[PDB]
Design a protein around this nucleic acid. Sequence first.
DNA 1: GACCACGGCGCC
DNA 2: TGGGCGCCGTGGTC
Length: 539
Amino acid sequence: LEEAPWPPPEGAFVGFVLSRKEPMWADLLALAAARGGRVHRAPEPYKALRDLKEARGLLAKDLSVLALREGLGLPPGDDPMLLAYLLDPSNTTPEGVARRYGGEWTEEAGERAALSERLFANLWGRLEGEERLLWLYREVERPLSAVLAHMEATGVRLDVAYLRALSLEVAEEIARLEAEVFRLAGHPFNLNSRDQLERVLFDELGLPAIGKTEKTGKRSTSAAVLEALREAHPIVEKILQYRELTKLKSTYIDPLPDLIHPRTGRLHTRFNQTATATGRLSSSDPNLQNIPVRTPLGQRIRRAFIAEEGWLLVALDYSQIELRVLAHLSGDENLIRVFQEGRDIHTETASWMFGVPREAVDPLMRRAAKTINFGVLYGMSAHRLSQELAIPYEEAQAFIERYFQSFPKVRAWLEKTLEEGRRRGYVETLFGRRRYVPDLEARVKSVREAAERMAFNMPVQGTAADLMKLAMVKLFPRLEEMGARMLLQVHDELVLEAPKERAEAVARLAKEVMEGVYPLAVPLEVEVGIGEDWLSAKE
DNA sequence: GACCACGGCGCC
DNA sequence: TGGGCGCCGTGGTC
Ligand SMILES: [Mg+2]
């Protein structure tokens, strides 16, 4: 490991240290590069950043993000993490990827660059004759790492003053519920403490314990348990309400405003690219993929997300991408005609299980077909089906068998995936992204059947992901050539920011690029809204 | 202060 | 016996 003075040969492997994991908040403590068997250690890291053509190494996207806040372009290129992730998506961290493919992840820039070259070598050849996963790395993941670096650096604009006024409203509503419940308890206790609540609910008050917690076996105070004791006591509704408010206060309203960045006046997530078993992205520090939208107070928080002045937000949402993906994968003639005909899946699905004349008089069957249609994706069981309808474990089974008479190639796809899973030891997406699921042949049924749900969701969830990522790759350069921005992805939706004048012209472009990303035996449909805020934009 | 397991819950 | 995530407070350890 011979030490050459800094200016490194072109195309070298970078190795960097940050004071903290978040590139947008980090100081560049150290910089290195490696090519052949030579270590080029930068004396002045931020200065040294100017000399690179592209970032190439573990966490390439991170360095490209920090470079971007500093004004420097610098895209990300090869990343052994991206390759390892495609071999086996349980490869999430460089600690692990190193300590599996022949290195040690250290807290030193040069050894991080020495690790990069070494890890990349040992992995790119480990991808010999994986045409499919090489296509995924070239035409999806490497390019996307750039797109994500641009998104992460842009950030999304937030109305702080608005959030701070909320905090004061919600604070006060919390205070009333708090003092209600205590009066009902006949004493005050910490309502954030589920231990203390447990005692209050089940010992002190006389209430029935419905279920128990997994690891420790305490009486559960979850929503599903409290929603089931709604009738039994007026303290329960209050507790439910107090959880709603404190969850949203503690998770979103209170902390988000403090994470505005001095240089931008914007919020910056991290989009982790090698963090999940299916090939979805996750979002982090903070997570903007779980900003609320169901509840009223929830919907008020979402208004806080706004466009720069003079711009608008464009929100684009795929419409049942996962069902459509299933239809494509299963090849169920019946099911794909429901999307080709431009019909309302759950309407038609109800009108096929029961087989009601045409489409007529189905208010409680709409719920019934909707529920099954996502419950085939997660492996929803009869009991669970029986619990969500008010109907018993018996009629619910027949719903399941009926649905498979409606859709016989779904079942055959299901079973085929399971068997090839056991055979090859993994399952895979339409683009050949794989997830190894070795418990498919476990001797304990609970764990086997748990494995099976994991196993047959992955091809659909990962294909929806694959489809979204490829769209992001395709769409982005069209947005840049239009001075539009790409702000967030939320699994099957995209939030873009565009200038008021061109906003409709961006919407149209974005929508069409997404409906046409990779055409299937069904069509992809996309809803689009425009607005000053995320809520308004009509997600 | 930094971190941990847990139960809980927001989103797709 | 519902897939995939990340973050909250509590209660507790160094
Ligand atoms: Mg949506």
